[PDB]
């Protein structure tokens, strides 16, 4: 009769074929990543190409289906996701051109090697050369030279290519009814078809600006403390009121400030949270780590894992006989096949990452009943949020006390708590302002308000304002520093970290309130709290089948994002920083720069 049952039956067929197709693709990917051989690469390529061809076929088939007005909450969302083809909405020639330009900056960023001036034949890639130099060599001159080399050797070849990339992305967005490619990425967060819970695309900008405005004093105090500590370390390289150099942030771009902690620890003589020797003494192995993690999720209210995972997954290093990329990854292969790759050592890093991986598998399992196009999170920042909240909950020392992973005489004190909060701030909080700066710059560039000849002529001003960092070496328009990161050069979004951090803090506060936790938020554990586990699993099972705000309210009860859990969690850090910064200037000065005296 009408188009309702027509679309229903077409989507049933699409689900039936896509389950098997993604099953084959994921099986090939798992074979490749666990076994680095040319045949495995060819199999992965064939599987991916076949899946892309089938997606093209399904989009073509669904194109004749009229938009009309259908509000089943599944079929409309599925056809909307299938319709946004993107690269294929323009002509074939323009698609080939954008593929060429995409591979252009991809290869340029991958092979942006820098060679030492004293030895032309000695060249280093981004890994492990620049990473090791950044994380180990604390010399000011070497870090500055590495920053200069990385942002000089690569940006010149990228500037006009990124110009054409921005133009083409704007073209694709405008052809698909988005004002800019930024609006295309907003469309994921767009909420419509529900009464009383609608979310506008400008509401994202409004909420982001409001949240960053509230966060600004926290970043100001943290940056002032870092400036004071590094000026104590570097008397003649940092102004008392000026902005910190780009290479004195703990990394190369400003993404994470972890390496500053060793130079900015309040009490370094006190021990740091590390129980590697404990698991070494107890003769632990990675299978025991996974068993303990499954037991912990049983305690918090999750059912145990099936035998298929333990028969199929790999939980340790397979050696070089069949090579494997040891980046810990999860797979929902389809047809109830769940797996994880991880080269597990007896470490706390591996412990936390393993909780992320297996709780991330559990999150994937939560929406098993949802159809194929609904086998995803409500927004781009829920799976990482679940992983991070599980890591934070399992990282609490009391959680280790119950299972005997550390000596009970640790005697949690104020100094250790402040050290842990500072590590969190320089690891989790330390990325929020930089992420906001980069995402705002990308938004304003895509929207067309930033002239090309002035692109960085805006960035390095706002860097003196938002991030509070002044460029150490002047650059002309040839260089392309703002686009010298992984996300921009690999065609991925960047707001996911900010959204994930906000969501993870809200989720942790909700679980703690549902767990009858008393005291500071950082000393909160969800173990043996099935109520909070089920309350969060209510969100987990929803997936993307429903708008993200309803899922958010289902656990926290708040329809809009807010930073109140951030204040509740970091209040001791706020008080300590305010007490310490009584005789130091708060804020950064835009006029100061190392290269001008």
């Amino acid at each position: 009769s009408t188009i309702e049952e027509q679309a229903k039956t077409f989507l049933d067929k699409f689900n039936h074929e896509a389950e098997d197709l993604f099953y084959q693709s994921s099986l090939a990917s798992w074979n490749y990543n666990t076994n680095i051989t040319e045949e495995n690469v060819q199999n992965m390529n064939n599987a991916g190409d076949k899946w892309s061809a089938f997606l093209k076929e399904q989009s073509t088939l669904a194109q004749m289906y009229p938009l009309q007005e259908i509000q089943n909450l599944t079929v409309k969302l599925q056809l909307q996701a299938l319709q946004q083809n993107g690269s294929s909405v323009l002509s074939e020639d323009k698609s080939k051109r954008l593929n060429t330009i995409l591979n252009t900056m991809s290869t340029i960023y991958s092979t942006g090697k820098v060679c030492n001036p004293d030895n032309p034949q000695e060249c280093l890639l981004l890994e492990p050369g620049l990473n090791e130099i950044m994380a180990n060599s604390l010399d000011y001159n070497e870090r500055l030279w590495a920053w200069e080399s990385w942002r000089s050797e690569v940006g010149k070849q990228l500037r006009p290519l990124y110009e054409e990339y921005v133009v083409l992305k704007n073209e694709m967005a405008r052809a698909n009814h988005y004002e800019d490619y930024g609006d295309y990425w907003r469309g994921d967060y767009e909420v419509n078809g529900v009464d009383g819970y609608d979310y506008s695309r400008g509401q994202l900008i409004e909420d982001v600006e409001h949240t960053f405005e509230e966060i600004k004093p926290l970043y100001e105090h943290l940056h002032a403390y870092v400036r004071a500590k590094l000026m104590n370390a570097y008397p003649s390289y940092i102004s008392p009121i000026g902005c910190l150099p780009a290479h004195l942030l703990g990394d190369m771009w400003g993404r994470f400030w972890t390496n500053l902690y060793s130079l900015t620890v309040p009490f370094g003589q006190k021990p740091n949270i590390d129980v590697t020797d404990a698991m070494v003494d107890q003769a632990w192995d990675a299978q025991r780590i996974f068993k303990e993690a499954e037991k912990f999720f049983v305690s918090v209210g999750l059912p145990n894992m099936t035998q298929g995972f333990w028969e199929n997954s790999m939980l340790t290093d397979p050696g070089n006989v069949q090579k494997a990329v040891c980046h810990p990854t999860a797979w929902d292969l389809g047809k109830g096949d769940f797996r994880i790759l991880m080269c597990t050592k007896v470490t706390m890093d591996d412990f936390l990452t393993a909780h992320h991986e297996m709780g991330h598998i559990q999150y994937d399992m939560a929406y098993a009943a949802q159809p194929f196009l609904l086998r995803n999170g409500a927004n781009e920042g829920f799976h990482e949020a679940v992983g991070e909240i599980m890591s934070l909950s399992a990282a609490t020392p009391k959680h280790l006390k119950s299972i005997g992973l550390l000596s009970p005489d640790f005697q949690e004190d104020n100094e250790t708590e402040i050290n842990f909060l500072l590590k969190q701030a320089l690891t989790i909080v330390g990325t929020l302002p930089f992420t906001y700066m980069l995402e705002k710059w990308r938004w304003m560039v895509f929207k067309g308000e930033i002239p090309k000849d002035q692109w960085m002529k805006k960035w390095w001003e706002m860097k003196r304002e938002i991030v509070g960092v002044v460029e150490p070496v002047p650059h002309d328009e040839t260089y392309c520093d703002p686009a010298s990161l992984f996300h921009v050069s690999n065609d991925y979004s960047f707001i996911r970290y900010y959204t994930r951090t906000l969501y993870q803090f809200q989720f942790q506060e909700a679980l703690c309130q549902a767990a009858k936790h008393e005291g500071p938020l950082h000393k909160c554990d969800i173990s043996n709290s099935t109520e909070a586990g089920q309350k969060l699993f209510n969100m987990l099972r929803l997936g993307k089948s429903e708008p993200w705000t309803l899922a958010l309210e289902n656990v926290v009860g708040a329809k809009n994002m807010n930073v109140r859990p951030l204040l509740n969690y970091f209040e001791p850090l706020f008080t300590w920083l305010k007490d310490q910064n009584k005789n130091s200037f708060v804020g950064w000065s835009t006029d100061w720069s190392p290269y001008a005296d």
Binding site: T306, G308, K335, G336, D337
Partner: protein
């Protein structure tokens, strides 16, 4: 429709063999009867044969 099977599939998808029994208790001449297993044949003792 194709009705194949695989061993990787979990509980609920592995193939099962099922058989049925149709009876009739309507009053009719009896054909299929049970032997009521067996008992040892006692002798020279008042019993219930």
């Amino acid at each position: 429709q194709s009705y194949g099977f695989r061993p990787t599939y979990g509980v609920g998808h592995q193939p099962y063999r099922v058989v049925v029994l149709s009876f009739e208790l309507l009053h009719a001449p009896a054909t299929v009867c049970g032997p009521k297993k067996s008992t040892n044949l006692v002798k020279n003792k008042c019993v219930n044969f």
